[PDB]
Amino acid sequence: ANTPVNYQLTRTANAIPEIFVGGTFAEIKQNLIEWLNGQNEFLDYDFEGS
Amino acid sequence: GIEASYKFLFKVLYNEEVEIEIESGAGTEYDIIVQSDSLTEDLVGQTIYTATGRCNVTYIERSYSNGKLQWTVTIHNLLGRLIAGQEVKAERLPSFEGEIIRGVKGKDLLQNNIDYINRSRSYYVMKIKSNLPSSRWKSDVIRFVHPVGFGFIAITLLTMFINVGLTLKHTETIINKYKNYKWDSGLPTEYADRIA
Amino acid sequence: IQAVQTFTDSTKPGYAFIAAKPKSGLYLTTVQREDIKNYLKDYNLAPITPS
Amino acid sequence: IRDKNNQYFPRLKLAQGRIVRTEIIYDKLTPIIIYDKNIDRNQVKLYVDGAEWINWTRKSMVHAGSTSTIYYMRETIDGNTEFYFGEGEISVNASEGALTANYIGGLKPTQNSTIVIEYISTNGADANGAVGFSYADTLTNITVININENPN
Amino acid sequence: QKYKNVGGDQIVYHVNENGEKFYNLISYDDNPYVWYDKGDKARKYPQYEGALAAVDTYEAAVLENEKLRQIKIIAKSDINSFMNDLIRIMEKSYG
Amino acid sequence: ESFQFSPSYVDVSSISNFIIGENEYHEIQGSIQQVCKDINRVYLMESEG
Amino acid sequence: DSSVIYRAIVTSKFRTEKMLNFYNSIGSGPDKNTIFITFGRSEPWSSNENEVGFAPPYPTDSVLGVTDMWTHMMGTVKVLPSMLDAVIPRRDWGDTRYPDPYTFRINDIVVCNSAPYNATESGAGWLVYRCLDVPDTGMCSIASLTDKDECLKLGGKWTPSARSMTPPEGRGDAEGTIEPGDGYVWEYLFEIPPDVSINRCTNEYIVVPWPEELKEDPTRWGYEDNLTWQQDDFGLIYRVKANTIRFKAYLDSVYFPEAALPGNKGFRQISIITNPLEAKAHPNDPNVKAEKDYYDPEDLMRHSGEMIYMENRPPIIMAMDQTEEINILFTF
Amino acid sequence: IYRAIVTSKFRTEKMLNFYNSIGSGPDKNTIFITFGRSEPWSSNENEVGFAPPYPTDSVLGVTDMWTHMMGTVKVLPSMLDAVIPRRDWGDTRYPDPYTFRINDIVVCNSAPYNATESGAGWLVYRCLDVPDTGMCSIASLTDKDECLKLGGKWTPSARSMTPPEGRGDAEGTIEPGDGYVWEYLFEIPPDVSINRCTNEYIVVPWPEELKEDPTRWGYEDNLTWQQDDFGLIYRVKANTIRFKAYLDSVYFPEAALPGNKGFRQISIITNPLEAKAHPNDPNVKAEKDYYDPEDLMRHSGEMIYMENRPPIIMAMDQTEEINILFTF
Amino acid sequence: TKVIENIPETSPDRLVHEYWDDGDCTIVMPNVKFTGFKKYASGMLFYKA
Secondary structure, three states: OOOOOOOOOOOOOOOOOOOOOOOOHHHHHHHHHHHHOOOOOOOOOOOOOO | OEHHHHHHHHHHOOOOOEEEEOOOOOOOOOOOOEOOOOOOOOOEOOOEEOOOOEEOEOOOEEEEEEOEEEEEOOEOOOOOOOOOOOOOEEOOOOOOOOOOOOOOOOOOOOOOOOOOOOOOOOOOOOEEEEOOOOOOOHHHHHHHOOOOOOOOOEEEEEOOOOEOOOOOEEEEEEEEEEEOOOOOOOOOOOOOOOOO | OOOEEEEEEOOEEEEEEEEEOOOOOOOOOHHHHHHHHHHHHOOOEOOOEEO | OOOOOOOOOOOOOOOOOEEEEEEEEOOOOOOEEEOOOOEOOOOOEEEEOOEEOEEOOOOOOOOOOEOOOEEEEEEOOOOOEEEEOOOOOOEOOOOOOOOEOOOOEEOOOOOOOEEEEEEEEOOOOOOOOOOOOOOOOOEOOEOOOOOOOOOO | OOOOOOOOOOOOEEEOOOOOEEEOOOOOOOOOOEEOOOOOOOOOOOOEEOOOEEEOHHHHHHHHHHHOOOOOOOOHHHHHHHHHHHHHHHHHOOO | OOOOOOOOOOOOHHHHOOOOOOOOOOOOOOOOOOOOOOOOOOOOOOOOO | OOOOOOEEEEOHHHHHHHHHHHHHHEOOOOOOEOEEEEEEOOOOOOHHHHOOOOOOOOOOOOHHHHHHHHHHEEEEEEOOHHHEEEEEEOOEOOOOOOOOOOOOOOOEEEEEOOOOOOOOOOOOOEEEEEEOOOOOOEEEOOOOOOOHHHHHHHOOOEEEOOOOOOOOOOOOOOOOOOOOOOOOOOEEEEEEOHHHHHHHOEOOEEEEOOHHHHHHOOOOOOHHHOOOOOOOOOOHHHHHOOOEEEEEEEEEHHHOHHHHOOOOOOEOEEEEEEOOEEOOOOOOOOOOEOOOOEEOHHHEOOOOOEOOEEEEOOOEOOOOOOEEEEEEEEEO | OOEEEEOHHHHHHHHHHHHHHEOOOOOOEOEEEEEEOOOOOOHHHHOOOOOOOOOOOOHHHHHHHHHHEEEEEEOOHHHEEEEEEOOEOOOOOOOOOOOOOOOOEEEEOOOOOOOOOOOOOEEEEEEOOOOOOEEEOOOOOOOHHHHHHHOOOEEEOOOOOOOOOOOOOOOOOOOOOOOOOEEEEEEEOHHHHHHHOEOOEEEEOOHHHHHHOOOOOOHHHOOOOOOOOOOOHHHHOOOEEEEEEEEEHHHOHHHHOOOOOOEOEEEEEEOOEEOOOOOOOOOOEOOOOEEOOOOEOOOOOEOOEEEEOOOEOOOOOEEEEEEEEEEO | OOOOOOOOOOOOOOOOEEEEEOOEEEEEOOOOOOOOOOOOOOOOOOOOO
């Protein structure tokens, strides 16, 4: 009944390559704040230090 | 909208074989000899029929025997086996009536020819054949290639592709060495040896 | 064909008409008519048989 | 066919520039580039291993089928020619049926296919005019006494 | 950067004396002057013979950026007179 | 079709390369009767007519 | 160490031979096989069956599997030998659709007259040529060799460089394109008359004539002209080495309205049966082979005869006033 | 996207047609078997481990084989039999004489250890059910019933006590006790056994030949309920035919003479036509048992099966035998 | 390759004539008939035999 599936259709209704999608600033930072972290140049610096 | 559009269409789309029927089609050539009298020739391109079937004439020439003209038409293809005498009527026109028709070629059918049954319109409105069931292919072809303004009629078919032979082989061949007792011999070489 | 004049009739679908003066003659000769429609036939809208 | 008097003229017809054939192995994913500008579109021909291929380009993939020997020229944005093909990629269910047309108008040369393509680098500006001609080649046993220019 | 994954110091093309760039070419080394291209294994179809230059990817980079040298510009005199006009057009372009 | 002619050529043969035209074929004809008593005996000749 | 080590092969002809035999074995009434073809299982494989990508369960062979297939069976249809034909894959000169229309490989078999672009000659049915020799320049299937002749001297396949100029022509026994010039040579076989073309031929597969049916007319097949030296021959299928037979069948709603009725979920699976026996009221009564073209599965004896070949499909829906066609082929 | 299968029976079926298809004279196949190529493969050919070059199929390959061909022998249908691999109850030499798998087919009375019963030809039983304890082919399952309910193969632990007996329908040593149960098929009469049977392959009777005696084959006893049946070969599902042929020096002394390096390669041919002095003369299919390749028309008949071996040397007064098994 | 030919040495039948005359040259031909080519032709050649 209704719709069974094997991994079907594609990528919602329409393309959103979605690397492009604007995210929430905090998350943007939250993403980027990680980015600077793990940077080989410094593993020392604490970012949550205001 | 070209023919090739249709066939190709599923190749990309359904990657499966389709065929769509127009009467003219690829097959073109004609053998019979028609005796009629001053037919409008508008029927050139418009099929006529016996029992065995109906096909369209691109144009007619008519030449003289006995002083009645002899129409010699020009047709694409044939439905059913022609016969010298056949009951003739124009698909497109009711009014006209044709000669008995000399040359003969067929189109095969489970129950050949007869009147078949229940031919629409002039039923010619052009046919389509494929494996895949319609309503799967129904919406898109009109969405794509099949024109508005026309219906079409669809018979379906299937084929089956099966290896018998790969299983068949020769397993192995063997042979044997025997000493036949024909009499007609002396012993001499050696002796004895195998003893019951 | 000096000028070829295409037309149809709605009464008969599936078909197309073109008008031709071979201008070598008052009537278009046949050998053309088979030669052309042949070459023509390459592009024919499947539901339609041009004539 | 050589003519009585032992000599013969061919008709023949010519183009600007020089040939380059480039033998290239096939890869699933690689762009097949011609870095060379001055190449001429219709002066190009490729051999897949074994086969010269057509381009539709100027023509129609909905014409023919999937499974067709063929190629498509195109343009890298850099300004040099990449060209490609389609996969009609082909299979047999059991062996009994005919070779299956799948995918799209074209036929994919399998991986590792040998691809040589032949074309012409060209200078088309000075190409026009150019009446004055000569036989640059040398071919054994075949000696042109005259080339009749603006022949025929 | 751009070549690194492909490879460094990649010889991009052979350029003849005349200046004609020859892409995808190598000499079989018996006669360095005869050039069988590549993917060929040579032994066959040398597409040219003679002495050609080859272009280093570094040097290759140079000529690219080299082309950028000249620019088409408008006179510093007219730069002002020009400016107003376009501005005025933008008013027509505002509406 | 194809080849232009034009004021061109002395050669007969280059044109013969294709005049168009038509080429050879074989055909088999009829059964045979023995002149006498065996057909293997008899032999054939055909002048063109 | 292995003392004796030997090699042996079956010719492709033996495939053909089985076929020709197998063709012989369909009988009329007596002592030669009779064939019925059956469909059934209105019942759904599973709820998915409709959806795309669904593959019905792979059929099962067993006295159990038989019974089940034998259980659901909707309808049955006989097969006349004249619906059985030998066929080879059709390949036409100049056909755009398929790759290299102009490039032919040795021993390939090319059809002429099939299509307008193909057609050289009017007033004749389809032609069948085989391509003996291909242009000298080309590429070898064995990568080691750049010469056609050398490629072939080892026997590796060769693909020629130069495309065919023209489709082959002539009845003439050797006669591809030999004198004036070309890389291809063409071998002639026979010509196919149009009606059979039209009715039998599928653009993938030409239909190939039987030796028997050939014995009737060598001319209608254009074969009368040639040269055999064995006398009558007609064994042509040997020369072409067709390994493939085409079963053709025609289903019609009328014989089996019950499975045809509106709302039938159609038949999932197909089964063929050989030499079944009629239903009998009294089990001691002698068996009877089945003449009529269709039998409701009831009118057939349970399990009588042997069914060689079982099939399972996504449901197919028959419909009344539809006329559905089935083809099954065989390479022996 | 559909799924479909051919029954194993159709293997059998091909044979039966094919068996039907060998004709006597008319309009049904006739089969000749040919040997040839005195010529040495290579100097090595004699040596151990030598494998002749893999044969070639072509009008060329034909010609060459047709060239060297030493001799030719016909085949009468009575030299064609259906066969299945022989396995006897209790034979020590070979593994698990006492361990049988479901549906295996067991011959009885063949040998003294085998023999239960004197005064009866060989018996053929199939083993319906096997002891409960055993081993599964699928390592995941420890139950025979579960192994089989899923369909994986099962190997039983417990050996059979005795080879099965009785004409009746499943016997099976079911009542008193055993892990094996047994179904009866038919009995093989001795004469056919000795002469036909290869210790690897018993000969399976033809349905026609069956139509003649149900008794001599012990099949008369059973139950068919279809009236005559006799389609027994379906039940055993033999897909394999055994060609038997007899070569003799006498027909071909020339190849028999002392010092021949023998024939390398073998070929069978179907429906060749006789030599004719005059090619217009009507063709003649070949009755006699042997023909010098000369006495046969060039290229006449079809050779299905080509063969290449290290050289075998025939000798006069020697008698050589060939067996060939086609698995359809 | 039909021919327009023979009747040489100005024999009355030919009607083929060069006419030098009147300061000029006049060259006459009968109309040409062609059939049964079975094939697609372009052009026509008058080939001096």
